[PDB]
Amino acid sequence: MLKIIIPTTMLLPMTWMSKHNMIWINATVHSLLISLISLSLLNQLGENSLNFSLTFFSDSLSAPLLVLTTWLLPLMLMASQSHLSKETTTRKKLYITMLILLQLFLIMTFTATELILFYILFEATLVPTLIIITRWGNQTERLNAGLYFLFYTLAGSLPLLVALVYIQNTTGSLNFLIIHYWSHPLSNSWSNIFMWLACIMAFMVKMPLYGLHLWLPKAHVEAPIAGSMVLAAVLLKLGGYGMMRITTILNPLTNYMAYPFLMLSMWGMIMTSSICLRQTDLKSLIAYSSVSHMALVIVAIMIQTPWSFMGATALMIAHGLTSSMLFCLANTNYERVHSRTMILARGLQTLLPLMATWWLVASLTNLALPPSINLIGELFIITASFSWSNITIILMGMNMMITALYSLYMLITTQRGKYTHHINNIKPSFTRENALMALHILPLLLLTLNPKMILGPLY
């Protein structure tokens, strides 16, 4: 695994020893090459895992997340090139350093054979994101947003640490392989109930769970474009990955303890999809859509059936790509209009036709149009839920209908109708933005050809 970690570390001295006007080119080229190298982790086994060493191991759940993490950095650099133009070389190098450190921590987090090492890196990712949000955000609310994004996380994560060390004091190890092979049932006890809660709540808060989702709209709205991209694409999936790893020690207590979270997610997906219908801000609408999709992923993980896990993996990958694309489109509009109010700039199809095509395809993938991987994950989760209980179909279908409604509402409001007359600074789309949009969308339509790459270890 060092053949990916070491180049990502070398990205830092290369960035800091670069010319003042070569940082973006060098960073983009070498991050793309690192993505290409990481692409060879996809050759997974039907047996246990790719156990590289005592410290790092790869799995067909970890490999798609690793590849998406490596692929996201070049897109983040391309998106950040525009709004950082008027800023000094040292500060741009610091921004690229924060992005590189975030990638390094995420890469080490997804392999992380140890649960304490996983926790340490899973919490180390917090610092670069907070600095990016509270340093290079625009509005005055960013500081407040950062505070939320901080404390919520720690409010969930501090009990987990205690639980973790407690387990190693009883089991003797926190290695995931030993934990899986030596797993034992949890008796229905108050102590075991609180151990279950301490294990679950940390990952629940970062999905986020419906009741615990307040930090996400603030953090995603006030963050710069690279921050929003990394928050929606990779950082939300840490909770799902952690739950998928940790639910192996929580059986059979998950059967009883899953009910409040299942109800919260099943009702909150409807609530947040309905919230999307009445939203005056593009970024907030995209954030609430992310909350709905992650609610579906929470349901899938809580059901803990093979089809549930496959659907959850597919949906995590598809949502990451789609939400990053949607945020990039919103930012392309914002850098022209500087308002971030959906109703202000209207009828952009007549002025930006190719960008309108990008908007249409992004809305189509968000709408879960078959045979996209978005719908593959959606349908697998829905079928698993139907087997779990036939009444889930009402909530699932209502969520599908509202999702289509708000996706097409977002498309029609911004692209169709009549152009706003007083806005005359809508310049033609740059090659950088179109390239960014294509680099988001072609991986999705190309992954629909080989779904088993993103269906997880239970395929």
Partner 1 sequence: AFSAPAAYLTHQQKVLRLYKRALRHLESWCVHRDKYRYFACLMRARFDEHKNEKDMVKATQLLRQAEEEFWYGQHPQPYIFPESPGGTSYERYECYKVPEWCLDDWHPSEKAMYPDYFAKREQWKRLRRESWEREVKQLQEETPPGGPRTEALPPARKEGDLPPLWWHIVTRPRERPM
Partner 2 sequence: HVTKDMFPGPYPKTPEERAAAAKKYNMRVEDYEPYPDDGMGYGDYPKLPDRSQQERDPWYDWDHPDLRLNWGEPIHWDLDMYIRNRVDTSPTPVSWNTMCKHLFGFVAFMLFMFWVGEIYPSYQPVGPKQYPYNDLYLERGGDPTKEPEPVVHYEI
Partner 3 sequence: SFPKYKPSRLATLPATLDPAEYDISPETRKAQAERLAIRSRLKREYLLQYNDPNRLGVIEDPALIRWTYARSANIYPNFRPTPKTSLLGALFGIGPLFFWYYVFKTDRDKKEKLIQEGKLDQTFNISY
> Among residues 125, 174, 175, 167, which one has the least CA distance to residue 150?
125
- Give yes or no for a contact between 230 and 257, defined as CB atoms under 8 angstroms apart: no
Q: Report d(CA 208, CA 225) in Å as an integer.
A: 20
Of 7, 159, 306, 451, the one binding partner 3 (CB under 8 A) is 306
Rounded alpha-carbon distances, angstroms, from residue 289 to 221, 283, 294, 329, 456: 13, 10, 9, 15, 23
Strand, helix or coil for residue 50: strand
424 binds, options partner 2, partner 3, ligand PLX, none, Cβ within 5 to 8 A by partner type: partner 3
Q: Is residue 211 part of the contact set for ligand PLX (CB under 6 A)?
A: yes
Determine phi and psi for 452, rounding to 5 degrees. Answer: -65, -15
72 binds, options ligand CDL, ligand PLX, ligand PEE, none, Cβ within 5 to 8 A by partner type: none
Q: Is residue 43 part of the contact set for ligand PLX (CB under 6 A)?
A: no
338 binds, options partner 2, partner 3, ligand PEE, none, Cβ within 5 to 8 A by partner type: partner 3
Q: Report d(CA 291, CA 328) in Å as an integer.
A: 18
C-beta neighbour count of 49 within 10 angstroms: 18
343 binds, options ligand PLX, partner 1, partner 2, none, Cβ within 5 to 8 A by partner type: partner 2
- Give yes or no for a contact between 336 and 344, defined as CB atoms under 8 angstroms apart: no
Name which of residues 413 to 442 contact ligand CDL (CB under 6 A).
441
Number of Cα atoms under 13 Å in the Cβ half of residue 212: 24
Q: Is residue 2 part of the contact set for partner 3 (CB under 8 A)?
A: no
Q: Is residue 338 part of the contact set for partner 3 (CB under 8 A)?
A: yes
Q: Report d(CA 353, CA 415) in Å as an integer.
A: 9
Instruction: Tell me the closest approach of the beta carbon of residue 42 to ligand PLX, in angstroms.
Output: 8
| CA angle centred on 151, ends 150 and 152, rounded to 5° | 100
Listed ranges 107-115, 236-244, 422-430, 437-445: which one lies at the site for partner 3 (CB under 8 A): 422-430
In the complex, residue closest to ligand CDL by CB:
372
> Among residues 299, 241, 239, which one has the least CA distance to residue 267?
299
> Among residues 135, 71, 75, 128, which one has the least CA distance to residue 99?
128
Name which of residues 389 to 428 contact ligand PEE (CB under 6 A).
405
Q: Where are the beta strands (DSSP E) in 269-329?
A: none
446 binds, options ligand PEE, ligand PLX, partner 3, none, Cβ within 5 to 8 A by partner type: ligand PLX
Name which of residues 347 to 366 contact partner 2 (CB under 8 A).
347
Q: Where are the beta strands (DSSP E) in 352-435?
A: none
To 10 degrees, what angle do helices 373-388 and 282-303 make? 50
Name which of residues 351 to 410 contact partner 1 (CB under 8 A).
351
Contact residues for ligand PLX, defined by CB under 6 A: 35, 39, 64, 67-68, 71, 188-190, 193, 209, 211-212, 257, 260, 317, 443, 446-447, 449-450
Where on the chain is the footprint of partner 3 (CB under 8 A)?
259-260, 262-264, 266-267, 280-281, 284, 305-307, 337-339, 341, 343-344, 384, 387-392, 395, 421-425
Interface ranges with ligand CDL (CB under 6 A):
353-354, 357, 360-361, 364-365, 369, 371-372, 441, 445-446, 448-449
Binding-site ranges for partner 2 (CB under 8 A): 278, 280, 343, 346-347, 412, 417-418, 420-422
